[PDB]
Ligand binder design. Sequence first.
Ligand code: NFU
Ligand code: SF4
Ligand code: SF4
Ligand code: SF4
Ligand code: FES
Ligand SMILES: [Fe+3]
Lengths: 138, 447, 298
Amino acid sequence: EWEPKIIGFCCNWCTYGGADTAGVGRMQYPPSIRIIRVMCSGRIEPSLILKAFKEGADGVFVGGCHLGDCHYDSGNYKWQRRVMMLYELLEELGIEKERLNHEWISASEGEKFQNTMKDFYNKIEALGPCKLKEELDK
Amino acid sequence: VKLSVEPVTRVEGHGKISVSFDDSGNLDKVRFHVVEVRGFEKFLEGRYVEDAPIYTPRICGICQVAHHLASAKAVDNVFGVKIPETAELLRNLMHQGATVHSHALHFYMLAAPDLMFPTTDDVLKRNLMGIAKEHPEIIKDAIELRKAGQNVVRVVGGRAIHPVTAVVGGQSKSLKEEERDELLKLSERTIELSEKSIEVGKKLLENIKDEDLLDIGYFESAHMGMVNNGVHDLYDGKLRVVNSEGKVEYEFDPSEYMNYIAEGVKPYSYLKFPYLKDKGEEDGIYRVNTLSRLNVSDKMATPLAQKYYDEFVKEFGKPCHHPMLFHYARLIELLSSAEMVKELLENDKIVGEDIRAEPEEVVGDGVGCVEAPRGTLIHHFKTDDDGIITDTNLVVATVQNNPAMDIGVRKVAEKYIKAPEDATPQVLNYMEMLIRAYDPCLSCATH
Amino acid sequence: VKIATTWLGGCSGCHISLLDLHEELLNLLENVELVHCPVLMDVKEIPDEVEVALIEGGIRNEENLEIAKEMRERAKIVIAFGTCAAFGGVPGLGNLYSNDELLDKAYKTTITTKNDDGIIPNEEVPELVSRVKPLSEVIEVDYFIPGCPPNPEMIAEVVKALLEGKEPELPKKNLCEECARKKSEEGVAIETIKRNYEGNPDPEKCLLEQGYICLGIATREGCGAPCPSSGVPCSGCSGPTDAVVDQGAKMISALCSDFGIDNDRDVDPMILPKSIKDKIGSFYKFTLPSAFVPIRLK
Ligand code: NFU
Ligand code: SF4
Ligand code: SF4
Ligand code: SF4
Ligand code: FES
Ligand SMILES: [Fe+3]
């Protein structure tokens, strides 16, 4: 009767490749997520995540290269500082910290991506729908 | 039959008057309603205490300085810090500059149109444009007073509206010798215009007296105001309350305000109804600002103001309960503040560099009090060991004249309205004249 | 030219800034035809055929909504007058609590309050709207004058342009352009984060490089940067630039990016969230209602 709406942000060099590898390997995972491609996770900033919740996201996922393996050397280190503040800002706004998920997944790690998608879907499904859009549409 | 005056014009904020009649056609219920509320007391919870002087000024755009300083003081108590003398003087200078602008604003741009045209039908004439069209000299002077006051606020406070220099332990910047010199030179003109203003008021209140309008909304109540050794003071001292006969009932430190003041809640207005706790809802009614302060004070702190106050006291006595004479007292205060701006600028300590004292350990309780141009202003904050606000309470000036404004409008209707036909545009404006006498700031009062 | 003004969930500060034109206000009022202005005149209803309308304040109660809608129908050009109208303003922080919590504090639990039956004023007073909203969320706004309050010269410049038929143009850059504080040529690097009362700030060096959360970097110019020049950080009262929707989000991004940039790979990413104990109040003082997440879920 209700299926989570999850948006994803994946870097072109690793997680986007990781996600493709899951597909090549037919690694089935829940169909809630919809991935947006960026070149680096360093491109990801608070406004992209907050915009997603505004639009009605039940969960927001972000995937970048392993720390130290960014195709652009240190893009993910900036995103890591940005996401930690964002977790706390979401709690201050009444959004469960768990509705945001960030992971480091390389292009070959298809199994990790599959399992991260499985685990995240279950997490959001258990939390139920994020009632922000319904609250705003009043 | 039910009539409604909405919005009440030439007042700050959202107010309205209802006038109901019974089936026979006789006057039934007359009430004053305030239709706004933002809830500053609750949303300040969770905020940084040192950020209170940034949020409270946004309670009102006219008396923002009063809130900035009241918050600064409370915050200075939250941190066990006593600010340096130069900071106390800069804060007071900002406070007097602000009072000149607020009093000039109210008298000339909000009150004067009625005092000048009390029985007109031309609604388009009852405003500063109508006054400027026949007496431009009056509006030019109002503007020059306002500009002078706001200039002081801008120089000492950083911004003419929503100042920012009153920080934890004092001021963020000092007043430079050149700035001081420029302001002191301009101060003499502000006093001259303030003296002239008192005469414009005498003339206009004489016109009000000729139309039997000087006694509108009359009732006797207690009066509260801040005094420093019994002398009129808008920045420091203790809060004094005199009874309807002029006897001093209480004299207390603003930090003990909760033991003397109480605020009742009526279902027809977002504005509370305060009263003296010991006396009650009816026997404890008190008023604040201008006349109420003159009434509690032994004397004025400045000489020119003292002379007009002496002349007024001999002619109208002490205490004076006339709502319409609040206009007169407002002019005496416009002059005292103008005189004080000069006095403070002449005090060599104003240009000192010892403007800040280093904040001490956080004490989770702090009360800030100043006499805003519309009455006693109290900001009370409670915080955690981190200095994050956990609870707040604001007793904002005009809220204390709400009982007076609600009684007063009823009394105007009782005097001029028997049947609905009697409620003519001029009579309805008489009700708004009583409201305006108290110089209400409804955004302030509700916060 | 029939001009009109009204005020909603604000504080009158924008109207006072209009009056801070002083001598120039009379010159303006001789050119324009003021047909409605609650603070200055007694015309009770908004008349029809209004050419330009200045609407102060954001949407806080049911009546604000009715007035906004009425002014939109009577006026050819609607102007969100000031930060409250444009971005929601300081009252917008009320969105962190339920309307019941804001009202229960003011009319029940405040220390001085005496309310026996425990009632919330509900007779002849309007109900509060679910959340504070910028004027553009309920009606179509043609232009806007940012600032809390907007400087008097800016108000005149905008009104003047509209009377001439010209389209008004606001400044585009961020505040550091106007700020007189010196910046490091090597770029910004933040070592620690201090609350405004911590330490004694250097009067010449940029407050952001000194560890204070200064919003000038994420705030539109025009005010003249009076706050940093006065010794305190910018609180972001003019709102974001035209290229930034959420000011707070961009400010956090910038702040997190430069925090410990000289030790980029080893700096602890938990120092910053552990240090800022009031995130919303630090980044959304004047713009919470215009943010992507403009409320707190309860
Ligand atoms: N004067 C004043 Fe305010 Ni706008 C009121 N009433 C504040 O304390
Ligand atoms: S933008 Fe600022 S000055 Fe203008 S109404 Fe809002 S709080 Fe007042
Ligand atoms: S103090 Fe603020 S406005 Fe000034 S240069 Fe630094 S960040 Fe920019
Ligand atoms: S410096 Fe910042 S807080 Fe100060 S007036 Fe300008 S925009 Fe507002
Ligand atoms: S490229 Fe994958 S994180 Fe920078
Ligand atoms: Fe209160």
